[PDB]
């Protein structure tokens, strides 16, 4: 309010260097694939792993260490922000997660809630 600093402490100046949509589109491509109905039955690693409540919340931190996603690049960091630009799915507030708002049944016999 009354004079002060902005961010430059004593070295920093520029923010995080954003990657190219090339890698961001690839990452997000895995998600839209992961949550695929027919893939759900085969994607218990994202949903069934993170947790099993009802809303189905997926931690992005896990997607980074996901043998399928990690096969992309060691840049597990930008891998997060990359998703931050993915509004197709429902991500946790700091776009740190990736939950669903309308999941379809994958296994009616393998899963019996309530």
Q: What is the CATH number of the domain that holds 83?
A: 1.10.10.10
Determination technique used: NMR
Cα–Cα distance for residue pair 5/105, rounded to 1 Å: 52
Neighbours of 102 (CB within 10 A): 6
Structure token pair of residue 20 = 């190219």
Structure token pair of residue 85 = 């630009």
Query: CB of 47 within 8 A of CB of 40?
Result: yes
What is the domain count for the chain?
Answer: 1
> Which residues touch 89 (CB under 8 Å, ≥6 apart)?
28, 31, 32, 35, 98, 99, 100
Cα–Cα distance for residue pair 72/78, rounded to 1 Å: 11
Cα–Cα distance for residue pair 25/20, rounded to 1 Å: 9
Query: CB of 86 within 8 A of CB of 63?
Result: no
Q: State which residues form the domain around 29.
A: 1-114
> Which residues touch 31 (CB under 8 Å, ≥6 apart)?
63, 83, 86, 88, 89, 98
Cα–Cα distance for residue pair 46/38, rounded to 1 Å: 14
């Amino acid at each position: 309010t009354a004079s002060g600093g902005e961010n430059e402490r004593e070295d920093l100046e520029q923010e995080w260097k954003p990657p190219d949509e090339e890698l961001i589109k690839k990452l997000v491509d895995q998600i839209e694939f992961y949550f695929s109905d027919e893939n759900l039955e085969k994607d218990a690693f994202l949903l069934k792993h993170v947790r099993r409540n009802k809303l189905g919340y997926v931690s992005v931190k896990l997607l980074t260490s996901f043998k399928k996603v990690k096969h992309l690049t060691r840049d597990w960091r930008t891998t997060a922000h990359a998703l931050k630009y993915s509004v197709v799915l429902e991500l946790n507030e700091d776009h740190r997660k990736v939950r669903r708002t309308t999941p379809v049944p994958l296994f009616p016999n393998e899963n019996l809630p309530s």
